[PDB]
Amino acid sequence: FLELERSSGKLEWSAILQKMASDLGFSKILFGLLPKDSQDYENAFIVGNYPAAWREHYDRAGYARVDPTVSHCTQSVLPIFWEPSIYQTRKQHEFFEEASAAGLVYGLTMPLHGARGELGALSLSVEAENRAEANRFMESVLPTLWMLKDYALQSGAGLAFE
Amino acid sequence: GFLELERSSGKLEWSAILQKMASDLGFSKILFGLLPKDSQDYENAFIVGNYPAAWREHYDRAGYARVDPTVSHCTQSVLPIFWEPSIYQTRKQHEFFEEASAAGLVYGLTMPLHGARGELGALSLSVEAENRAEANRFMESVLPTLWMLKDYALQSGAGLAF
Ligand SMILES: CS(=O)(=O)c1cccc(OCCCC(=O)N[C@@H]2C[C@H]3C[C@H]3C2=O)c1
Ligand SMILES: CS(=O)(=O)c1cccc(OCCCC(=O)N[C@@H]2C[C@H]3C[C@H]3C2=O)c1
C-alpha cells in the first residue's frame, strides 16, 4: 500500500497495482476512474490487463449502459460479484456470453467514490474450476482488497487527473 | 454482524446495531455522520452515536466543523485519519484538542464516507487507552474489520438517513 501511495507515475503505479492483484490471485483487472459530474465512461482513466479486444469491443458496443456492474457502482459502495443472476436482460445474456469468450467469467467489482466526487471501480477477475472455488479465492482476500480499493482510489485519483 | 445492519428496518434499531458492534470491537465512543449531496451544512446532518451531548452541542455553537482537522481531511481523502497530536496545527485546533480531551475524546480514528449518491460523512471511533502507543496498536488490530464496516455502515446508513 505504501508503494502505491508513493508512486510518481501512472505507468509505475499501474505496475504496482497489477502485481498486487496478481499476488492475491487475480488474472485480469481493471481500474477505472472518472471525475466529478462526468459520466463519459469511454473517456475515463483506465488501467489494467483486460483483453484489448474485449475493451474496444465493449466501447464500440456501448456496453457501459449494458454492463450490470456499471449501474451497481452508481448505486452502491459495496462489492458486486459476477454471479450469473445479475445478467438479466436480452443484451446482458449476450454480454455475459461475450465476456466469457474474452476469459472474464468469475470475479468482483468494487465501486469507487472519491473525496473530489470521482466515480470508478476496481474490478478483479479470478480463474477457477467453478463459481464456488472463485468465491472461496475471492473471500480469502476480501479484507485485503477492501483496504486496497481505497488506497488505489486515493493514489489513483491523484495520478489520473492531478 | 454486518448483515443485520443492512437489514435494519429503521434508524433507531440500526444505530443500536452499530453502537454494539463498535463497542464489541473495543470502541468507547463513536459517531456516524452523514450529509447529503451538495451540502456542507453540518448542523442539519444525520447523526448517530454516543459522543458526549455537551461536546456535540459545544462543537456546533462553536462552528467546530470548520476547525475539526478530521472534517477537512474527510473532504480530501477516503483514507482513515488518526487523532495524533500533529493533526492539530492551528491555534484554534490546539484549543479544540484541549476541549475534546476534557470531553473524553483523546485517542481514536476517523473514517471518511463518500456515498454513491454524493453523501459526505464519517465513522469516527474513540479509544480509552493509557497511552497513544497502546491506542495505535488496538486500532491497527481491528483496522481491516473497520474498513469493511465503514462502507457497510455508509451503504445501509444512507438508505435510512434520507
Ligand atoms: C469508466 S469509469 O472507469 O469511469 C467507471 C465508472 C463506473 C463503473 C465502471 O465500471 C466498473 C465495471 C466494469 C467491469 O469490470 N466490467 C467487466 C467486463 C465483463 C466481465 C464483466 C465485467 O464486469 C467504470
Ligand atoms: C456533519 S457530517 O456528518 O455530515 C460530516 C461530514 C464530514 C465530516 C464529518 O466529521 C467527521 C469527524 C468528526 C469527529 O469525529 N470529531 C471528533 C470530536 C473530537 C475528538 C475529535 C474528533 O475528531 C462529519
Architecture overview:
Two copies of one chain form a homodimer. Chain A has 162 residues and is an alpha+beta fold. Chain A has a single domain (1-162), classed as Transcription factor LuxR-like, autoinducer-binding domain (Beta-Lactamase), CATH 3.30.450. In chain A, 46% of the residues lie in helices and 17% in strands. The first copy, chain A, has seven helices and five strands. A five-stranded antiparallel β-sheet of chain A has the order 2-1-5-4-3. In chain A, strand 4 and strand 5 (119-125) form a beta hairpin. Chain A binds chain B through residues 73-78, 111, 113-115, 117, 142-144, 146-147, 150-151, 153-154, and chain B through 74-79, 112, 114-116, 118, 143-145, 147-148, 151-152, 154-155. One copy of the ligand CS(=O)(=O)c1cccc(OCCCC(=O)N[C@@H]2C[C@H]3C[C@H]3C2=O)c1 is lined by residues 31, 33-35, 42, 45, 68, 70-71, 74, 83, 100, 105, 110, 120-122, 124 of chain B. Chain B: It comes from Pseudomonas aeruginosa (strain UCBPP-PA14). Chain B: This is Transcriptional regulator LasR. Chain B: GO terms for molecular function: DNA binding. Chain B: Keywords: DNA-binding, Transcription, Transcription regulation.
